[PDB]
Amino acid sequence: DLKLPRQRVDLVAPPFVHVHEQATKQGPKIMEFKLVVQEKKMVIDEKGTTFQAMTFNGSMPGPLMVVHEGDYVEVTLVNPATNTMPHNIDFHSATGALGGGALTLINPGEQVVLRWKATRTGVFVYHCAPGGPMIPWHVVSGMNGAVMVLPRDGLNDGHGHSLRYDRIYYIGEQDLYVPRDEKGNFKSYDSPGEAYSDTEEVMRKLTPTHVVFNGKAGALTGKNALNANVGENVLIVHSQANRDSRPHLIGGHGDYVWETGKFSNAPETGLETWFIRGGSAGAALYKFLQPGIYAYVTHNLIEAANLGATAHFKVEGKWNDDLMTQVKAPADIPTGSTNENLYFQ
Amino acid sequence: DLKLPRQRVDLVAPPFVHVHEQATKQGPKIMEFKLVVQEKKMVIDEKGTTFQAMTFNGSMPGPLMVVHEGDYVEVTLVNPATNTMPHNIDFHSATGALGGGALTLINPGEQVVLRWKATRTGVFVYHCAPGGPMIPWHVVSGMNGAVMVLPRDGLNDGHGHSLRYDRIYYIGEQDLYVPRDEKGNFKSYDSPGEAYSDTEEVMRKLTPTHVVFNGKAGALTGKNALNANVGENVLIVHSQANRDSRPHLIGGHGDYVWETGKFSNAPETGLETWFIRGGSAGAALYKFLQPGIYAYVTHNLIEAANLGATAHFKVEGKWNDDLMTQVKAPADIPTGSTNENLYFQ
Amino acid sequence: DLKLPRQRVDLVAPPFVHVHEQATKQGPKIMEFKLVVQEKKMVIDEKGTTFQAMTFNGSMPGPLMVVHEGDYVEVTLVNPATNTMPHNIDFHSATGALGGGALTLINPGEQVVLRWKATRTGVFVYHCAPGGPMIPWHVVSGMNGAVMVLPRDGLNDGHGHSLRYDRIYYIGEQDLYVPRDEKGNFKSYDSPGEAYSDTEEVMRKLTPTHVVFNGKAGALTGKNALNANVGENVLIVHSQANRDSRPHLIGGHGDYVWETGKFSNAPETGLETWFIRGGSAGAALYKFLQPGIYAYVTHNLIEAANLGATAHFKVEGKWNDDLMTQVKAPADIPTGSTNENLYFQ
Ligand SMILES: [Cu+2]
Ligand SMILES: [Cu+2]
Ligand SMILES: [Cu+2]
Ligand SMILES: [Cu+2]
Ligand SMILES: [Cu+2]
Ligand SMILES: [Cu+2]
């Protein structure tokens, strides 16, 4: 007997986001989304390591859902008969029944329809959580995404000023636990079930083998770099359903950062590095001031450079020599420079 | 020559809390507490693994002490002659002498009386800290608790509105470092001293074998679930004296969260997951809106499900279908559903 | 064509800081700094373990640079011909070209001059970042420091009150990854290049062998303790370029803490323990109220006591028995004390 208008949303693969309004004058709606569970082998690194992944909608992360405060979110969760395990969904945005997990457990060949009222603003994790040890294993197998619940008036700076983004990207970070053989090579498996025992042993020691954005090392570099232009205000939503992260935009800042990810809280200003606690989503606005390549990392630089957790932005525009300039290009060290007379010698 | 009234406090075992007022019109008092050190073997997991524990008042965590701003806290620390090691106490709430550690070192058969003025509001860790390597070892052996210093006016939302809790629970999280034999079995020892060398080796690699609430895996599940009712505002104090945590109430939120734990700072609103930095206590208020089981975890879900760090709430009340409802129970996937035509196939 | 006055800054070795003003009436200047890369073997622990370090200005951390909002910072980066590797510098305070890394890559025998406008207030990390796996390896080899960009009006409490420090100390925390032989002994190498392969293997498992302040275990204890006096307001700048930390002043508090480190954000008040996300600098003011030894730690107490991460303050002044006093010195436990009748027995 919820007599509200219904609006179907077509989800898009991360790091892109389905079309939505920021500020709206539309009243509350039943926002209809479909998530289809896909268990499949995926490539996770640049050497071609494969992985028995479990996904919402075939991606790591699952897609970003966007609704407004006071909307109702009606999610059809589908578990195709080609899958081997039960699945469900827990929305950190939702109230009751373990986030909906206690209402969405489906076997292969089943679907279920959950509605939750979007009473809490912010970016939130959603993840599979079937029970017991299956909870971490489904989540670190890739079954996690995020949902953004925007204020109807859109974002503000917590000091009565509207904030509008020109562009939005969703960065889902995934810790992966890939078994190795005696020789230190990553092991391949024919099913998630066959990988489980060896994978739980790696999981137990809490140290990922891979930490990736958008499902694989290099996913958001080279050809798949994130585009932007000088002057654009870009919202960067970052989620980590299992493990902490410390995002940093190399050559940039977080102009406005909700590191705990909830828009009822004023953002922090001018951050270098922020913190996404495992089990949450956060968000950072930045207005690009300079063109060129930016690397977006977790600033555990070992994770960023050696375990997969670097994305790139390619920003078009004119260089601003006032903000930064190379005064003198690399040149031989004079004489007659008196390095040798310095304090620390 | 402190001529204030004296009030003796009877401590209770966590996760319960001794009777106290929130707002008070009482003036500053000397609040008298007794903590008795108990070294003893304890069971820490559901397979019956034992552990040479060191405790305040026989529990992990030690009990929650509750006082008001400007009270004086007079702690009798007792180290019974049946114990084998010196102990002391460091109050993160206190000013001077390493939190009182430099004034409370006692051998077995000794007691000492420390007074500290409650000048700082919030929830704080207290822990043993005898010196050198004994500091981490006493703390990760279980010698840590918390103290709450309430404003005399009780809690507020940082925006001039009173916040009152119906119910308070203290969740002490403990990282444990249990040696394993060649075969991967947990080792048993006859004394804390005999366990030390092997335990320090595990401690050095920074990866707990167990992460538990109230001293053991399963301590706050099944029969020992935390009770609440729909409409109750519940304060959840969480401490971790050694290692970070990211609390999350599955199916709930943090309405008001002091993740750094200090009531001179406005809480954040509507959090999904918060962050307890090792060496601190934090606190979250939540008003239950839905009945049923809630799991309260660290949202490193590997820690939560596989290393012990899950508690349950059992909440009585009437389900609210407006906040969340199962629109359609699990059913076979139509035909004629066109899964196969979806974008990500 | 930047026609501003030029001011040369003489850097000093951490934990000291070069002379500067807090509030200034000086207009924007070109602030000239020189950083000289020094690759050298350094001692990192109390057992004399050596390490193939890479440094700015021969120290871990590199020195603290201090400027004011709207200054321009003109950095001459020097890579002497006695070094073996290329180096560069990334300023988290700077906008564009990967923080300046994309404008400062120099071979041994070269120098380069970078200018960046100090548009963002706070404490920021600077670090070497040559590209790819060399980024973490240069950073965890010691090539990181910090820069403080003060408001021209100096610090404030975010509530319109000026905050002034009597004394400033820069604590650079360094995670180190030292290979071990079959026997568990730390390995020595003749060059950074020869250490690389074995070091990357340790780095990959994300668990430091050492966590140190000012480059070595014990660097800021005993003779090299940090001095202060009762009544002094001390600013403690803490940086970690690669890995999280949770600073705590044992026997003290953070009166005013910018844990994300950016002065456009009001500090938090009265913290026990704060959080420095890897890849950032934060800062805490404290007014000493009590004399004596204070230990300043990361409150992973295993790291603090067993991997090197403890500093000391030695504070001169008169003890305040009102804040804390030993009511009764250690004494035998009465009879007739009824320990045995207590709840937890
Ligand atoms: Cu699943
Ligand atoms: Cu969750
Ligand atoms: Cu002890
Ligand atoms: Cu402590
Ligand atoms: Cu370098
Ligand atoms: Cu960086």
Short mmCIF file of N, CA and C in Angstrom, two decimals, chain A residues 160-251:
data_model
loop_
_atom_site.label_atom_id
_atom_site.label_comp_id
_atom_site.label_asym_id
_atom_site.label_seq_id
_atom_site.Cartn_x
_atom_site.Cartn_y
_atom_site.Cartn_z
N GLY A 160 26.13 26.04 4.71
CA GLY A 160 24.99 26.66 4.01
C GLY A 160 25.33 27.04 2.58
N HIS A 161 26.32 26.39 1.98
CA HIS A 161 26.64 26.65 0.55
C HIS A 161 26.45 25.36 -0.23
N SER A 162 25.72 25.42 -1.33
CA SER A 162 25.49 24.30 -2.27
C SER A 162 26.84 23.86 -2.86
N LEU A 163 27.06 22.55 -3.00
CA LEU A 163 28.22 21.96 -3.72
C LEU A 163 27.64 21.11 -4.84
N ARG A 164 28.07 21.36 -6.08
CA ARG A 164 27.60 20.61 -7.25
C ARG A 164 28.79 19.95 -7.94
N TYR A 165 28.65 18.70 -8.35
CA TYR A 165 29.74 18.05 -9.10
C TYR A 165 29.37 18.07 -10.58
N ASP A 166 30.41 18.27 -11.38
CA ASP A 166 30.35 18.17 -12.86
C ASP A 166 30.44 16.71 -13.30
N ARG A 167 31.03 15.87 -12.46
CA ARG A 167 31.44 14.52 -12.87
C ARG A 167 31.57 13.70 -11.59
N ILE A 168 31.19 12.43 -11.67
CA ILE A 168 31.21 11.49 -10.55
C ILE A 168 31.87 10.21 -11.01
N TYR A 169 32.75 9.72 -10.16
CA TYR A 169 33.36 8.40 -10.36
C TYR A 169 33.28 7.61 -9.07
N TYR A 170 33.01 6.32 -9.23
CA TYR A 170 32.94 5.37 -8.11
C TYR A 170 34.16 4.47 -8.20
N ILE A 171 35.00 4.60 -7.18
CA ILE A 171 36.20 3.76 -6.95
C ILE A 171 35.87 2.72 -5.89
N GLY A 172 35.67 1.47 -6.28
CA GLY A 172 35.52 0.38 -5.32
C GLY A 172 36.89 -0.26 -5.16
N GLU A 173 37.36 -0.32 -3.93
CA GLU A 173 38.66 -0.95 -3.60
C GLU A 173 38.37 -2.35 -3.07
N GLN A 174 39.15 -3.32 -3.54
CA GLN A 174 38.94 -4.73 -3.18
C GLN A 174 40.25 -5.31 -2.69
N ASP A 175 40.24 -5.79 -1.46
CA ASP A 175 41.31 -6.65 -0.91
C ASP A 175 41.02 -8.08 -1.38
N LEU A 176 42.02 -8.72 -1.95
CA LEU A 176 41.91 -10.11 -2.44
C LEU A 176 42.97 -10.97 -1.79
N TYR A 177 42.62 -12.23 -1.59
CA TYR A 177 43.40 -13.20 -0.79
C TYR A 177 43.64 -14.42 -1.67
N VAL A 178 44.70 -14.40 -2.48
CA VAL A 178 44.87 -15.44 -3.52
C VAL A 178 45.90 -16.42 -3.03
N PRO A 179 45.52 -17.70 -2.85
CA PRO A 179 46.51 -18.70 -2.44
C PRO A 179 47.72 -18.81 -3.37
N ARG A 180 48.83 -19.19 -2.76
CA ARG A 180 50.09 -19.47 -3.48
C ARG A 180 50.51 -20.93 -3.23
N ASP A 181 51.17 -21.53 -4.21
CA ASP A 181 51.77 -22.88 -4.07
C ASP A 181 53.10 -22.76 -3.32
N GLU A 182 53.73 -23.91 -3.06
CA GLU A 182 55.07 -24.01 -2.41
C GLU A 182 56.06 -23.04 -3.05
N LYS A 183 55.98 -22.85 -4.38
CA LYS A 183 56.97 -22.05 -5.17
C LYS A 183 56.67 -20.55 -5.11
N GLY A 184 55.56 -20.15 -4.48
CA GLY A 184 55.12 -18.74 -4.37
C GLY A 184 54.27 -18.29 -5.55
N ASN A 185 53.87 -19.19 -6.45
CA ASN A 185 52.98 -18.85 -7.59
C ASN A 185 51.53 -18.81 -7.11
N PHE A 186 50.74 -17.89 -7.65
CA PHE A 186 49.29 -17.91 -7.38
C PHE A 186 48.67 -19.18 -7.97
N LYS A 187 47.78 -19.77 -7.20
CA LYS A 187 47.07 -21.03 -7.55
C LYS A 187 45.81 -20.62 -8.29
N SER A 188 45.43 -21.44 -9.26
CA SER A 188 44.17 -21.34 -10.02
C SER A 188 43.22 -22.44 -9.53
N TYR A 189 41.92 -22.18 -9.55
CA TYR A 189 40.86 -23.15 -9.16
C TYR A 189 39.74 -23.14 -10.20
N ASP A 190 39.02 -24.25 -10.24
CA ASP A 190 37.95 -24.46 -11.25
C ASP A 190 36.60 -23.98 -10.72
N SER A 191 36.48 -23.72 -9.43
CA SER A 191 35.21 -23.27 -8.83
C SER A 191 35.52 -22.45 -7.59
N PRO A 192 34.63 -21.53 -7.16
CA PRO A 192 34.78 -20.85 -5.88
C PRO A 192 34.90 -21.87 -4.72
N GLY A 193 34.04 -22.89 -4.71
CA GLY A 193 34.07 -23.97 -3.70
C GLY A 193 35.45 -24.59 -3.58
N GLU A 194 36.12 -24.89 -4.71
CA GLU A 194 37.44 -25.57 -4.65
C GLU A 194 38.49 -24.59 -4.10
N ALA A 195 38.31 -23.29 -4.33
CA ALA A 195 39.28 -22.28 -3.85
C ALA A 195 39.11 -21.97 -2.36
N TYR A 196 37.96 -22.31 -1.78
CA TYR A 196 37.58 -21.77 -0.46
C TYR A 196 38.64 -22.11 0.59
N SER A 197 38.94 -23.38 0.82
CA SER A 197 39.77 -23.80 1.97
C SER A 197 41.11 -23.05 1.94
N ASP A 198 41.80 -23.07 0.81
CA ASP A 198 43.12 -22.41 0.68
C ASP A 198 42.95 -20.90 0.84
N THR A 199 41.86 -20.35 0.35
CA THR A 199 41.62 -18.88 0.41
C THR A 199 41.38 -18.47 1.88
N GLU A 200 40.62 -19.26 2.63
CA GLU A 200 40.34 -18.92 4.05
C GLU A 200 41.67 -18.88 4.81
N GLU A 201 42.63 -19.73 4.44
CA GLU A 201 43.93 -19.75 5.16
C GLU A 201 44.63 -18.41 4.92
N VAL A 202 44.54 -17.89 3.73
CA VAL A 202 45.21 -16.59 3.44
C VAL A 202 44.45 -15.49 4.16
N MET A 203 43.13 -15.53 4.07
CA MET A 203 42.25 -14.53 4.71
C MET A 203 42.58 -14.43 6.20
N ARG A 204 42.82 -15.57 6.84
CA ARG A 204 43.03 -15.61 8.31
C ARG A 204 44.22 -14.75 8.70
N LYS A 205 45.23 -14.64 7.84
CA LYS A 205 46.46 -13.88 8.18
C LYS A 205 46.31 -12.39 7.82
N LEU A 206 45.16 -11.99 7.31
CA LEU A 206 44.70 -10.58 7.23
C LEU A 206 45.50 -9.78 6.23
N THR A 207 46.34 -10.41 5.42
CA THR A 207 47.24 -9.66 4.52
C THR A 207 46.83 -9.96 3.09
N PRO A 208 46.22 -8.99 2.39
CA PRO A 208 45.84 -9.23 1.01
C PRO A 208 47.05 -9.50 0.13
N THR A 209 46.82 -10.30 -0.89
CA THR A 209 47.79 -10.49 -2.00
C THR A 209 47.66 -9.40 -3.06
N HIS A 210 46.46 -8.84 -3.17
CA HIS A 210 46.13 -7.81 -4.17
C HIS A 210 45.21 -6.83 -3.49
N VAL A 211 45.35 -5.58 -3.86
CA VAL A 211 44.43 -4.50 -3.44
C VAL A 211 44.20 -3.74 -4.73
N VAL A 212 42.96 -3.77 -5.21
CA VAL A 212 42.69 -3.29 -6.58
C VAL A 212 41.50 -2.34 -6.58
N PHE A 213 41.49 -1.49 -7.59
CA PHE A 213 40.36 -0.61 -7.92
C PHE A 213 39.67 -1.18 -9.16
N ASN A 214 38.35 -1.22 -9.12
CA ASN A 214 37.54 -1.64 -10.27
C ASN A 214 37.98 -3.05 -10.68
N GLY A 215 38.37 -3.89 -9.72
CA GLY A 215 38.43 -5.35 -9.91
C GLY A 215 39.80 -5.86 -10.33
N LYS A 216 40.75 -5.00 -10.71
CA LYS A 216 42.03 -5.55 -11.21
C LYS A 216 43.09 -4.48 -11.12
N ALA A 217 44.31 -4.92 -10.93
CA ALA A 217 45.48 -4.03 -11.08
C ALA A 217 45.45 -3.43 -12.49
N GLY A 218 45.60 -2.12 -12.56
CA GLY A 218 45.68 -1.44 -13.87
C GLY A 218 44.32 -1.16 -14.49
N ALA A 219 43.23 -1.47 -13.80
CA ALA A 219 41.85 -1.33 -14.36
C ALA A 219 41.60 0.11 -14.78
N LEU A 220 42.09 1.08 -14.00
CA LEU A 220 41.78 2.52 -14.22
C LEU A 220 43.05 3.29 -14.59
N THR A 221 43.99 2.65 -15.27
CA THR A 221 45.22 3.29 -15.81
C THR A 221 45.26 3.08 -17.32
N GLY A 222 46.24 3.68 -17.97
CA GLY A 222 46.37 3.68 -19.44
C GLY A 222 45.07 4.07 -20.12
N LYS A 223 44.57 3.23 -21.02
CA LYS A 223 43.34 3.47 -21.83
C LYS A 223 42.15 3.81 -20.92
N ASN A 224 42.11 3.25 -19.70
CA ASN A 224 40.89 3.28 -18.84
C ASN A 224 41.07 4.33 -17.73
N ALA A 225 42.03 5.22 -17.92
CA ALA A 225 42.18 6.39 -17.05
C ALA A 225 40.85 7.16 -16.98
N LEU A 226 40.62 7.80 -15.85
CA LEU A 226 39.44 8.65 -15.60
C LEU A 226 39.70 10.03 -16.20
N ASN A 227 38.76 10.47 -17.01
CA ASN A 227 38.87 11.77 -17.70
C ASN A 227 38.30 12.87 -16.81
N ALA A 228 38.91 14.02 -16.97
CA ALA A 228 38.40 15.25 -16.38
C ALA A 228 39.03 16.42 -17.11
N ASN A 229 38.55 17.60 -16.79
CA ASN A 229 39.04 18.86 -17.38
C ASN A 229 39.32 19.83 -16.24
N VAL A 230 40.31 20.69 -16.42
CA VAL A 230 40.55 21.82 -15.50
C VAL A 230 39.25 22.61 -15.31
N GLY A 231 38.89 22.87 -14.05
CA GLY A 231 37.72 23.65 -13.64
C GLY A 231 36.57 22.75 -13.21
N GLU A 232 36.61 21.46 -13.55
CA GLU A 232 35.52 20.53 -13.20
C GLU A 232 35.66 20.15 -11.73
N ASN A 233 34.52 20.12 -11.07
CA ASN A 233 34.39 19.64 -9.70
C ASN A 233 34.04 18.17 -9.80
N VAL A 234 34.91 17.30 -9.34
CA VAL A 234 34.70 15.84 -9.52
C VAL A 234 34.44 15.20 -8.15
N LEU A 235 33.32 14.52 -8.01
CA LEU A 235 33.05 13.69 -6.84
C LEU A 235 33.67 12.31 -7.03
N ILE A 236 34.50 11.91 -6.10
CA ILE A 236 35.18 10.59 -6.07
C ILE A 236 34.64 9.82 -4.87
N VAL A 237 33.75 8.87 -5.14
CA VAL A 237 33.19 7.98 -4.10
C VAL A 237 34.12 6.79 -3.98
N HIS A 238 34.54 6.48 -2.77
CA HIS A 238 35.48 5.37 -2.56
C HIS A 238 34.83 4.45 -1.56
N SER A 239 34.84 3.16 -1.82
CA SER A 239 34.30 2.16 -0.85
C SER A 239 35.31 1.07 -0.60
N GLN A 240 35.25 0.52 0.59
CA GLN A 240 36.02 -0.66 0.99
C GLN A 240 35.16 -1.40 1.98
N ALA A 241 34.66 -2.55 1.60
CA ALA A 241 33.68 -3.29 2.42
C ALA A 241 34.32 -4.12 3.51
N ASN A 242 35.64 -4.28 3.52
CA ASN A 242 36.30 -5.26 4.42
C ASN A 242 37.54 -4.71 5.13
N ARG A 243 38.18 -3.71 4.57
CA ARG A 243 39.54 -3.35 5.01
C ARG A 243 39.74 -1.85 4.83
N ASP A 244 40.49 -1.22 5.70
CA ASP A 244 40.74 0.23 5.65
C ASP A 244 41.50 0.61 4.37
N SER A 245 41.33 1.86 3.96
CA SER A 245 42.08 2.49 2.86
C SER A 245 42.39 3.93 3.23
N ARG A 246 43.41 4.47 2.58
CA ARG A 246 43.73 5.92 2.77
C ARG A 246 43.91 6.61 1.42
N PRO A 247 42.78 6.99 0.81
CA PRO A 247 42.87 7.63 -0.48
C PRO A 247 43.66 8.94 -0.52
N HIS A 248 44.32 9.13 -1.65
CA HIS A 248 45.11 10.33 -1.92
C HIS A 248 45.09 10.56 -3.43
N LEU A 249 44.89 11.81 -3.81
CA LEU A 249 44.97 12.25 -5.22
C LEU A 249 46.31 12.96 -5.41
N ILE A 250 47.23 12.27 -6.06
CA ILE A 250 48.63 12.74 -6.21
C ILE A 250 48.60 13.93 -7.17
N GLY A 251 49.05 15.06 -6.64
CA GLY A 251 49.04 16.36 -7.32
C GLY A 251 47.81 17.16 -7.05
#
